[PDB]
Amino acid sequence: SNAMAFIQTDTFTLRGYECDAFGRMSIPALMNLMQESANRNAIDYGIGIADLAQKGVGWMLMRFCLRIHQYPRYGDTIQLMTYPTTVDKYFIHRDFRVLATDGTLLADARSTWLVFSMEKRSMVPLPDFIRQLSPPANVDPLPALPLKPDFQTASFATAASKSVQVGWLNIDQNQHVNNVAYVQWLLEGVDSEIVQTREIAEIDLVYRTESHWHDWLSVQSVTETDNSVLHRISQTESGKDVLLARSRWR
Amino acid sequence: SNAMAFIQTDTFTLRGYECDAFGRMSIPALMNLMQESANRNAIDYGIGIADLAQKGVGWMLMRFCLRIHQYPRYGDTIQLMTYPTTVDKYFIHRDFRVLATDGTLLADARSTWLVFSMEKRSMVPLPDFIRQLSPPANVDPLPALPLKPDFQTASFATAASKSVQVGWLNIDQNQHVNNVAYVQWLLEGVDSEIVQTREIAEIDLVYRTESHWHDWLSVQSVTETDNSVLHRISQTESGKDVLLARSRWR
Ligand SMILES: [Cl-]
Numbered sequence: 271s272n273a274m275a276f277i278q279t280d281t282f283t284l285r286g287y288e289c290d291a292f293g294r295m296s297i298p299a300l301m302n303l304m305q306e307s308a309n310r311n312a313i314d315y316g317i318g319i320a321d322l323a324q325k326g327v328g329w330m331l332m333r334f335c336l337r338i339h340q341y342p343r344y345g346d347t348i349q350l351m352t353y354p355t356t357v358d359k360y361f362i363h364r365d366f367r368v369l370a371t372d373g374t375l376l377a378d379a380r381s382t383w384l385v386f387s388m389e390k391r392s393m394v395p396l397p398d399f400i401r402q403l404s405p406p407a408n409v410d411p412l413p414a415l416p417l418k419p420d421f422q423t424a425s426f427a428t429a430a431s432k433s434v435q436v437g438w439l440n441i442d443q444n445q446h447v448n449n450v451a452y453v454q455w456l457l458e459g460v461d462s463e464i465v466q467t468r469e470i471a472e473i474d475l476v477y478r479t480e481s482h483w484h485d486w487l488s489v490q491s492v493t494e495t496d497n498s499v500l501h502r503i504s505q506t507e508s509g510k511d512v513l514l515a516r517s518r519w520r
Numbered sequence: 521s522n523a524m525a526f527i528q529t530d531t532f533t534l535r536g537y538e539c540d541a542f543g544r545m546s547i548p549a550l551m552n553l554m555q556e557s558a559n560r561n562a563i564d565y566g567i568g569i570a571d572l573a574q575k576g577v578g579w580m581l582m583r584f585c586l587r588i589h590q591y592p593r594y595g596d597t598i599q600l601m602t603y604p605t606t607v608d609k610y611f612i613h614r615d616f617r618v619l620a621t622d623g624t625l626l627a628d629a630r631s632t633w634l635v636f637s638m639e640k641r642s643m644v645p646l647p648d649f650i651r652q653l654s655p656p657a658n659v660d661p662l663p664a665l666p667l668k669p670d671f672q673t674a675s676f677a678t679a680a681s682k683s684v685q686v687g688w689l690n691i692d693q694n695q696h697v698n699n700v701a702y703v704q705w706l707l708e709g710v711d712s713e714i715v716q717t718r719e720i721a722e723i724d725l726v727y728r729t730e731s732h733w734h735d736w737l738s739v740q741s742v743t744e745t746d747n748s749v750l751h752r753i754s755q756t757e758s759g760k761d762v763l764l765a766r767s768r769w770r
């Protein structure tokens with residue numbers, strides 16, 4: 271009755287508002303589309319958000335690393351593909367590839383997801399009905415994504431904090447803060463000089479604590495190298511980390 | 521070589537992130553799509569943003585009133601149509617209609633646009649090549665949109681101000697603040713109680729001053745009636761108005 275494995279593949283024509291002040295596809299727009307394609311793929315596998323919710327569990331995004339080889343532009347048509355590559359005790363690993371009409375690999379992403387128990391309020395082994403899934407054959411998996419990158423430990427002790435509040439518009443239809451909201455805050459926090467003169471080549475994301483509607487957060491960053499920046503978003507009150515990241519610029 | 525008139529018509533399948541915390545299509549997403557369809561229509565007419573820029577003039581959105589008869593939801597397919605209805609000395613009037621697969625009119629919008637001279641830095645009579653355009657025959661124009669609504673004059677003297685800053689993400693690929701950014705700020709400013717218990721039936725927008733990257737703005741609102749709110753966004757420094765609006769809720 272259902273196929274054994276699924277490669278989600280979607281064609282999107284870029285809208286004007288999906289492009290930044292330079293005419294390049296914005297990273298939040300891309301990531302939002304990636305999350306949509308990943309959701310459609312999960313549904314085909316019977317591991318969609320609703321499938322999990324109805325068994326009392328939910329997905330959490332832990333790691334996400336997006337590499338932009340070449341930015342598409344207004345009215346370009348792009349092909350977004352996504353699928354699981356491997357499934358282990360606690361994690362599913364999901365790849366994304368974005369192709370130009372050209373065939374050029376415009377962008378790729380790797381991601382790591384865990385399952386949270388709604389009873390236990392904590393990570394649990396992936397239930398059997400998720401362990402059992404077959405990733406698709408005949409795709410070439412992107413390189414491994416380190417679970418705990420070294421920048422996780424970096425100090426932001428002297429980095430100035432900028433305050434932001436979780437708004438209504440940042441809440442998705444699953445009643446959670448959209449993980450893209452954090453990337454938007456992080457991007458707004460980047461030095462004007464860098465924004466005006468460089469583009470992101472890669473953004474590597476480590477998600478820690480969940481935030482809620484109305485939470486106050488602090489956004490920080492530190493120059494790491496001539497073309498890389500580290501970023502931290504944390505709860506202003508508790509001081510708990512919500513997002514840690516590295517951006518590489520070119 | 522080109523047709524005499526154009527009805528822009530596009531079919532969009534709603535993505536998850538285009539829906540709010542209640543699963544209803546968000547107004548910013550709809551308005552962004554409307555602006556995209558209006559841009560594609562203008563290009564067919566030879567009055568697109570670039571067409572004007574290359575003659576040293578530009579469009580400004582003055583009035584926009586969106587009525588949502590029924591909110592579409594995730595994965596619904598909607599049909600967005602737009603066209604000019606009339607052209608007069610200074611203004612073009614543009615209608616939008618949004619249809620469900622059903623045929624239901626989900627939403628409509630009316631809008632009024634003027635032409636700004638880049639030499640004069642002020643509104644000018646529409647150039648001949650815009651005056652001459654033929655709106656499409658065989659469409660039923662929505663009711664007239666008052667140029668200067670009475671709420672324009674309302675006092676916000678005692679309404680508390682909330683401070684917001686124009687960010688990089690609010691700048692469009694035409695290097696202007698996206699007019700949707702103001703609606704997002706206005707929406708974030710609405711009483712939590714209202715957001716949690718009502719939906720917008722109509723939002724009526726009057727655009728005044730242009731803002732720029734990094735401008736500080738103040739967001740205010742006042743209860744007008746049991747199901748209506750007035751909103752004001754202004755430049756915190758100069759105190760000049762940027763947006764005045766009425767929302768009706770149901
Ligand atoms: Cl590292």
Ligand SMILES: [Cl-]
Nearest residue numbers: 669670671672
């Ligand atoms: Cl009025």
